[PDB]
Amino acid sequence: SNKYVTAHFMVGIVENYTVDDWKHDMELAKETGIDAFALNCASIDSYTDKQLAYAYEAAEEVDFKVFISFDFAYWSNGDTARITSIMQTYADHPGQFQYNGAALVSTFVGDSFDWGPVKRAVDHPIFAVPNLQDPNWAGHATTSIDGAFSWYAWPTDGGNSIIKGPMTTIWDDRFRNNLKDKVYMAPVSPWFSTHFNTKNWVFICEDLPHLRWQQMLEMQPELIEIISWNDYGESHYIGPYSEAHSDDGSAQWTKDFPHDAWRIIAKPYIAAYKAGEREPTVESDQLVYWYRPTPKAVTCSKDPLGPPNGINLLEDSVFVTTLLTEPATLTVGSGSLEFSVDVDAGIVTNSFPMGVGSQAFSVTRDGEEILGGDGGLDVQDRCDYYNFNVYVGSFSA
Amino acid sequence: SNKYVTAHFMVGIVENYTVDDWKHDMELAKETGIDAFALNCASIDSYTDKQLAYAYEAAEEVDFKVFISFDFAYWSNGDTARITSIMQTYADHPGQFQYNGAALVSTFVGDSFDWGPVKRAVDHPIFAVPNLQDPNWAGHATTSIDGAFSWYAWPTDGGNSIIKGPMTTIWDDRFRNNLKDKVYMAPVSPWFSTHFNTKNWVFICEDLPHLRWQQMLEMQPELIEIISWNDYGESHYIGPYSEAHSDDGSAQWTKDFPHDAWRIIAKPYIAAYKAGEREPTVESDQLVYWYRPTPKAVTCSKDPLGPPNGINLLEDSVFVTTLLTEPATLTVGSGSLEFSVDVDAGIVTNSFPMGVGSQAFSVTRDGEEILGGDGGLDVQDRCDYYNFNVYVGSFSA
Amino acid sequence: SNKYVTAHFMVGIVENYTVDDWKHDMELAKETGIDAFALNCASIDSYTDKQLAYAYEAAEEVDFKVFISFDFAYWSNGDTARITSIMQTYADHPGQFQYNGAALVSTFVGDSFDWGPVKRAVDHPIFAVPNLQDPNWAGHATTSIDGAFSWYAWPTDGGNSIIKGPMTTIWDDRFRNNLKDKVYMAPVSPWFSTHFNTKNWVFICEDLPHLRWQQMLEMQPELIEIISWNDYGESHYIGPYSEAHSDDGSAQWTKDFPHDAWRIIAKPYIAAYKAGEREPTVESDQLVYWYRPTPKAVTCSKDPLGPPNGINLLEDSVFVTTLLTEPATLTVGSGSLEFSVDVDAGIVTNSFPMGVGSQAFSVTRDGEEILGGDGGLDVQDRCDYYNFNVYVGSFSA
Amino acid sequence: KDSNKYVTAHFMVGIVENYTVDDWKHDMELAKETGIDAFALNCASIDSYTDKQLAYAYEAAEEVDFKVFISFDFAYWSNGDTARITSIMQTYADHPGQFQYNGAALVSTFVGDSFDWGPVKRAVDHPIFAVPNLQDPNWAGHATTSIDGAFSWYAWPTDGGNSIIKGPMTTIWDDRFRNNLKDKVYMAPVSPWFSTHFNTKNWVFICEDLPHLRWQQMLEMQPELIEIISWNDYGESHYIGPYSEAHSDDGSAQWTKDFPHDAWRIIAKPYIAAYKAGEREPTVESDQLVYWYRPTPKAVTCSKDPLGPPNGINLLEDSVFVTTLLTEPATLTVGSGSLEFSVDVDAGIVTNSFPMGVGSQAFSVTRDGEEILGGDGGLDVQDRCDYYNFNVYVGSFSA
Amino acid sequence: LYFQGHSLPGAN
Ligand SMILES: OC[C@H]1O[C@H](O[C@@H]2[C@@H](O)[C@@H](O[C@@H]3[C@@H](O)[C@@H](O[C@@H]4[C@@H](O)[C@@H](O)O[C@H](CO)[C@H]4O)O[C@H](CO)[C@H]3O)O[C@H](CO)[C@H]2O)[C@H](O)[C@@H](O)[C@@H]1O
Ligand SMILES: OC[C@H]1O[C@H](O[C@@H]2[C@@H](O)[C@@H](O[C@@H]3[C@@H](O)[C@@H](O[C@@H]4[C@@H](O)[C@@H](O)O[C@H](CO)[C@H]4O)O[C@H](CO)[C@H]3O)O[C@H](CO)[C@H]2O)[C@H](O)[C@@H](O)[C@@H]1O
Ligand SMILES: OC[C@H]1O[C@H](O[C@@H]2[C@@H](O)[C@@H](O[C@@H]3[C@@H](O)[C@@H](O[C@@H]4[C@@H](O)[C@H](O)O[C@H](CO)[C@H]4O)O[C@H](CO)[C@H]3O)O[C@H](CO)[C@H]2O)[C@H](O)[C@@H](O)[C@@H]1O
Ligand SMILES: OC[C@H]1O[C@H](O[C@@H]2[C@@H](O)[C@@H](O[C@@H]3[C@@H](O)[C@@H](O)O[C@H](CO)[C@H]3O)O[C@H](CO)[C@H]2O)[C@H](O)[C@@H](O)[C@@H]1O
Ligand SMILES: OC[C@H]1O[C@H](O[C@@H]2[C@@H](O)[C@@H](O[C@@H]3[C@@H](O)[C@@H](O)O[C@H](CO)[C@H]3O)O[C@H](CO)[C@H]2O)[C@H](O)[C@@H](O)[C@@H]1O
Ligand SMILES: OC[C@H]1O[C@H](O[C@@H]2[C@@H](O)[C@@H](O[C@@H]3[C@@H](O)[C@@H](O)O[C@H](CO)[C@H]3O)O[C@H](CO)[C@H]2O)[C@H](O)[C@@H](O)[C@@H]1O
Ligand SMILES: OC[C@H]1O[C@H](O[C@@H]2[C@@H](O)[C@@H](O[C@@H]3[C@@H](O)[C@@H](O)O[C@H](CO)[C@H]3O)O[C@H](CO)[C@H]2O)[C@H](O)[C@@H](O)[C@@H]1O
Ligand SMILES: OC[C@H]1O[C@H](O[C@@H]2[C@@H](O)[C@@H](O)O[C@H](CO)[C@H]2O)[C@H](O)[C@@H](O)[C@@H]1O
Ligand code: NA
Ligand code: NA
């Protein structure tokens, strides 16, 4: 079979993409180690058939792969006929991601969608790994599935309480015990913060951009899907902020908040995971940092939406992942405060109390400053709008 | 044999029950005409054998009956020795419900569990009526069953698909077709709404709390199991909200949502069903009402589970079942909406468009009001969490 | 706010702690609302540097904080240079508790230790709040202190006579009246009982597990230090009994005596204290109980140590703190004796006469029992060793 | 990991339904006398008296200052019994009678290699030291079941698959287990004998000098723990405890009621001491002799026995075995029927074996012409039998 | 002397 890493791509926000915009995304996906984009599309978008076409063409031109994620918040069980005709077009397309000789197909929800009639009407074999909510259902589904994709990327206990971290693998283990002789696609997400009038909460992630990958080496799922490449609206994008996507409102908390440096962390772990290593290998000294724009208690001045649910469980911290070939001393300035920790060789995340004002990072070995600089955003104690996304940046020696 | 009515009881949530807690539920089931509780227990609960012991003791003390429902979401075929030793304890307990001289036993799922080894190891005869997902396997079952219990209590196309109502008997007929001479335990459920990470949907029930009982008089299955007595998490409880049960998170949408009044509908139909009568007998003038707490299109922005699947197929209605000895006039006030219908004698369900605000109900005969009052709960257009449970109430002359 | 609660942690008994042991302790403190551990360490322990390093790392990993408590029962004024190099290691570690931007440092005694030389050699600012015996020295110390920590956690009148309680705030006033521009760290301690051949006495505490938090909301000090997290030797631990710690001989009176339930009282008072409320808020219905294992006059059978000084001033009582949302009746069975008392909503402590034998508690409201059970420990009228520690337990709804 | 070594003994809870606490006390006092630290309480989920007897056994332990731990017999317990396993551990992990290995509650199994201890440990407050019985050495080395060690059941000569090979016993399997138990704990098995005669199991392993040989191996190997198989498994003939009044006959009374094995504890005791003290030789206290032998030649034909002869018996020897425990060298003389043997024996603990003769058995130890101990075998060797019995009779004499 | 930073339940 081999191991593969996919990334969740929001087709709904790229109405105006060209083939070239797609190729730029997949090129940056390729150089992270990602094998394929899950193209998350909706029945209600007039641009779905066009943009699926562009994505598969782009995949073919840059030798990336793609598979379709039928987003069943929009698709319905009564859409079988359409879904079949789409699979007929793309299951045997050269750009279609193939898992064990079959066209991978997944979904967002759609636990009840029967893939049997789709599979029977398409010549080319299909490998159906829908997103399922219940591990028990994943182990006994009657819908002709070949594995399950868990959306449990963040700490949760089973209810609609926001719970503290850190992330545990409890839900992965429940899924895995039910999927014995089937495939498990584990989710990997750095972050979660959403601020729409139809959804306004955070999950408690913190060191999640690093720790989740550590869990992937322990657990070795058959597949990984990164949530997400470009879902700006829920703040878990690790892809670039593309000029051509259509803003859904999330520009407010994503436009000046690059997340690209998180691909610096994912890259060594994607390689280790595909190689079956238990520990990543650091090739050069780098540093990744992330922090929210304000302390969590800063009441904003203008926001037509309330503060997000769950923010009292966040910590006011600056997070720093160092990827070093030899041990060193990490020094962090956060506003008026300064901290220092010795940090070992390898990939290591530390958290520092967040202070209002300038952020500065330095890594020294013997007496040599090996890398360092100012964080790209000042922490503030005022805000117009509740922004619980994070700014991410990096230094590379 | 005779006909009996049973009710699904969650042992999993009564860890702290005393024998008296059981006896209270048992008395309320006895007043409804219920013959036995299905004790739905799991192997993974330390307290299963304790609460099974109290249950059987309580049954004998109040001349009530119980039988075990092994929940095979938790039990497995590896548990045969334990299941056999439990059957050896209780198959001839004085509280054990006996169906034509055999101890009734059932399950949740566990279609492939073989009762042969269990029956050949227990002296007392056992009557195995497991929950089977496949009507056809109910006819060719190699597992030494004496009947099948259907869990198709709600409108569905299979795979837990949600479809518009009303409830039909399509699945019941497949079971009775394939069972031939074996026993059929038909499910009766008033509602379905659940709001957890692993399950977040509604079935489209609506007038189901009445319409299913009418379907039972027409159908006359050998047995009936009410889903359920106390499954708060799925909103189909007809028993009281008990103070001793353990909250699984469902108190959020059930603490203030009594469903006791639905027993007013159940009681005369249970009697007609055991009598084999084709129509219920109304002894006194009564009215049962139910409705959801909000219009279906309300947005609950902080609820991290998001809205349940299926809600677009619901209607915003107030539902009213009248139990009338004589024709009369029903008037309902729903917010600013105003309705009046001539209701015939007997048991009749009417539904009316939902209006936000206070609800009011009145039955008049010869221009004299014979029962009425204000709905226990005001319908509202704002909400913290999605709740698609119903408030149920009644009025009696 | 700018108000924090700390707990006194015995570094001397955790030579074999791992970082993970420390994390478990800190997580349980974090759950209680405690902000930092006072790392009470000795110059003579070979493992002080290691275990200091562990604790600070663990604070970093679970985003807790720690500060060093130099135990001047062991440290001497001649240790200035070693204390300085330790403060240079940790004053700017992220795990280090910062108070108004300065590294908090404290001590056990050491009244005469001069902090000026330490402040002068350490670049990071330092906030020194040593334990001072004399309130007047707190008012006029020449040792460059920024506040004072009182050890007056129990009833005492200035001399070495043991006195009856209850606790008063007499010593708290004396300190505050000497610290009206510096910081007062007030002690909070639930109990006191020690039984070594170098210290063998009780203080008279009784209702102190609750009374002292009440005094804190009135006496609103700048900081609180809880005595203690894990000093089993003096029976004032509120932390778990950790198997990783090294028994000094106190296991004889602490192995079978959990104190964890006192954290149920602390948590609402810690919340109120930080939020400046003068009354705590009760979340759900709970009960905490505690009692000594024998009537105080029981002469025991093989104790190589005499009866502790002061035990004749104790009361043979069972103490119950009810945390309640509405009023209720509390009934207490102690041996062959049964008592009841009506109990208001809120947090209320009642004492009950001790009877030898088993102990039972139940809280009733509207006839229903809402919480109750048996105490984990039967009161005995014989014993091998003098044990004036208490057994603590709880019940929750 | 514990600075000290310990010896435990496998105890069948399944045969002691009618035990009282006092019956337990009696067994534990004789185990204490031997230097054994704890009983492994081998119990089954399907016994209605498991909780009654575990309770009695923990109380007895605390009352006589002995220790116990639970051996979950996974021929009956199943991986789906985590909840009950977990709750029994919460009852007993901190019981006064619970054996603690370096502060954690010891827990063991028979088989159950895939049972996951993680969920138990995580749900039990008091720490737990998981040393299950594992059949594969290689799997002891990278098990995913949260184990702190492995307990080997390779107590007898075998090529695996319960194959029967000639002895003498070697440590080939202990090495495999120790090689894969790098940092973790190895609990090695010590068994004197093996003969079982049931429908489901009817064979012998070739043990012979095993009741002594295996202890000598333990002083060279110094495993972190030892479990003696067994205290009272009468059914497999490896019991070293008394034949108790109160146990329930499972059918083994036929070959065990008149076959005391207590004298084997005389060999056990000094070797338990050298093992715990990390010493390479035992210390002999007084001159003693321990003898054992089967009741009949191995070619005896028992036509009435529907089980037929046990598998393996062709590799046995018709021998009488004698272990001498001498403070100074002496001469061993043995009479077996009309056979007559004498051999010089060094000081220390030495086993000799002599061809078996039908009839009266006799033993004598003399030093420079002077009798120091000896007497008649407790059982005449017979050449005709009703049922195949390949258990041994065991006796002793003391100077 | 070097630590693993933020880490999963297990190191130590
Ligand atoms: O009104 C703006 C926008 O509307 C149309 O475009 C929609 C497009 O914005 C986008 O909306 C998605 C949502 O569907 C939703 O996606 C969730 C996602 O957040 C997460 O839960 O994962 C699941 C599966 O991936 C998704 O269902 O929320 C995100 C923000 O967090 C929204 O951006 O996609 C939908 C459907 O594809 C589009 O209809 C309209 O075409 C466009 O012109 C306009 O800009
Ligand atoms: O032999 C036992 C133990 O000795 C060494 O470890 C010592 C360790 O037990 C512990 O001893 C403390 C005492 O120092 C003393 O602490 C008091 C405390 O009770 C209270 O008065 O407050 C002040 C400040 O907190 C402390 O001074 O008494 C407690 C019991 O109440 C003892 O546990 O810490 C000391 C010093 O750090 C250790 O030296 C030895 O290293 C260790 O291996 C051995 O187990
Ligand atoms: O999570 C907190 C809770 O966990 C443990 O108790 C469990 C208890 O909550 C309950 O769990 C139930 C689920 O098994 C499941 O029940 C299904 C029914 O919804 C439905 O009718 O269909 C089938 C068959 O009837 C059931 O499997 O979901 C419900 C909620 O809808 C949920 O209540 O029972 C289990 C197993 O018996 C308990 O283990 C824990 O023991 C408890 O202390 C804690 O409060
Ligand atoms: O398994 C749950 C489904 O049960 C019913 O669907 C049945 C089909 O799965 C199919 O099952 C056959 C089965 O009964 C058995 O006898 O062996 C056959 C060969 O392996 C199976 O193909 O056909 C049955 C007859 O049409 C169906 O009854 C429910 O209809 C479905 O909703 C459930 O998901
Ligand atoms: O029907 C509501 C219950 O759904 C979940 O339990 C499922 C079982 O009911 C059963 O689901 C059947 C399914 O296999 C399919 O083929 O069609 C039937 C009709 O829709 C379904 O009833 O089997 C599933 C797999 O084991 C179960 O997940 C919930 O767990 C349960 O609580 C609900 O009451
Ligand atoms: O070896 C004496 C025991 O045999 C039977 O129990 C077996 C287990 O001990 C174990 O057998 C191992 C087997 O898997 C093979 O791989 O070789 C090993 C060395 O010979 C064996 O020890 O597992 C078997 C399968 O579950 C068991 O049947 C008897 O039941 C037991 O009483 C004997 O003590
Ligand atoms: O055969 C009648 C007895 O059966 C039940 O007791 C069992 C015990 O005999 C005991 O069985 C051992 C068995 O598990 C295996 O290890 O072989 C041994 C012989 O070498 C057997 O002694 O343990 C079982 C499980 O713990 C018991 O279930 C009845 O309970 C008992 O009353 C009868 O005497
Ligand atoms: O409440 C209805 C749906 O709202 C949420 O999803 C929204 C999506 O449908 C679309 O309108 O975009 C917004 C954000 O731009 C999304 O929040 C729910 O999470 C979804 O499941 C509901 O069907
Ligand atoms: Na059929
Ligand atoms: Na055994």
Residue numbers in the entry:
A (entry chain C), B (entry chain B), C (entry chain A): 35 to 431
D (entry chain D): 33 to 431
E (entry chain X): 6 to 17
Q: What does the original paper state about this entry?
A:
These structures revealed a conserved acidic dyad (DxxE), found to be crucial for activity, and active site water coordination consistent with a classical inverting GH mechanism.
The two protein molecules of the glucose-soaked crystals each contain two glucose molecules located in the same position in the binding cleft, while each of the four protein molecules of the nigerotetraose-soaked crystals contain distinct combinations of nigerotriose and nigerotetraose occupying different subsites within the cleft. Crystals of the apo protein and glucose-soaked crystals were of the C121 space group with similar unit cell dimensions and contained 2 molecules in the asymmetric unit, while the nigerotetraose soak was determined in P1 containing 4 molecules in the asymmetric unit. When overlaid and considered together, the annotation of the −4 to +3 subsites can be observed separated by two acidic residues (Asp265 and Glu268) found at the beginning of the loop between β8 and α8 of the (β/α)8-barrel domain. Within different chains of the oligosaccharide-soaked crystal, both α- and β-anomers of nigerotetraose were observed occupying the -4 to -1 subsites. When the α-anomer is present, resembling the substrate configuration, a water molecule is positioned close to Asp265, 3.2 Å from the C1 atom of the sugar at the reducing end. AnGH71C has an active site water molecule, proposed here to act as the catalytic nucleophile, positioned by the dyad’s aspartate in a small gap along the protein surface and in line with the C1 of α-anomer products. Only small protein structural changes are observed upon ligand binding in AnGH71C with the most significant being the packing of the loop between β6 and α6 over the substrate along the +1 to +3 sites leading to interactions with Gly193 and Asn194.
